[PDB]
């Protein structure tokens, strides 16, 4: 399991635009509860929690804090029993 608490900024001359952009981004992240890691649509980043702190600085800190997790699988395989054979005696 790989977890990341990724923080996001939004900058603009119009602060109300910052509020609107953060609102739509949050709603998108929530209603679509995961994100395509790559265009192959193999992996996904299932959301855990998205939180905004409007008081936080626009540039240094960043308004929106999101936590994503992903579950890998150890890449190991082995030989397979395609064919089985045996005889009978007494």
């Amino acid at each position: 399991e790989i977890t990341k608490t990724m923080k996001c900024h939004v900058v603009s001359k119009n602060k109300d635009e910052i509020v609107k952009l953060l609102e739509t981004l949050e709603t998108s992240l929530i209603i679509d509860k995961r994100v395509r890691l790559r265009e192959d649509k193999n992996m996904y980043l299932t959301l855990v929690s998205v939180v905004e702190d409007r008081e936080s600085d626009m540039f240094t800190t960043g308004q929106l804090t999101a936590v994503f997790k992903m579950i890998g699988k150890i890449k190991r395989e082995g030989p397979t029993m395609d064919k089985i054979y045996g005889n009978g005696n007494l």
């Binding site: 030989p79 397979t80 029993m81 395609d82 064919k83 089985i84 054979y85 045996g86 005889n87 007494l90």
Partner: peptide
Amino acid sequence: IDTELQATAKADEFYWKWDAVK
């Protein structure tokens, strides 16, 4: 396990053997 045939068995193939009294 059919040890005589399984020693040279490739990855895909497996051998076994059974014997029983009646």
